[PDB]
Amino acid sequence: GEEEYQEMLENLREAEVKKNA
Amino acid sequence: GEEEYQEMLENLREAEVKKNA
Numbered sequence: 116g117e118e119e120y121q122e123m124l125e126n127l128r129e130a131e132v133k134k135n136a
Numbered sequence: 137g138e139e140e141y142q143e144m145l146e147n148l149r150e151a152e153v154k155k156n157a
């Protein structure tokens with residue numbers, strides 16, 4: 116549902132932070 | 137690349153809109 120979608124977005128956000136580090 | 141990451145996010149968003157509908 117919607118919170119599983121938000122959790123996916125947070126995993127992606129974390130990955131991007133690491134990419135950009 | 138950044139914009140390719142944003143376009144991916146946009147596809148993910150369009151698919152969640154449909155699911156939530």
Ligand SMILES: [Ca+2]
Binds near residue numbers: 118122
């Ligand atoms: Ca949560």
Ligand SMILES: [Ca+2]
Binds near residue numbers: 122125
């Ligand atoms: Ca969380």
Ligand SMILES: [Ca+2]
Binds near residue numbers: 125129
């Ligand atoms: Ca986190």
Ligand SMILES: [Ca+2]
Binds near residue numbers: 143
């Ligand atoms: Ca674009």
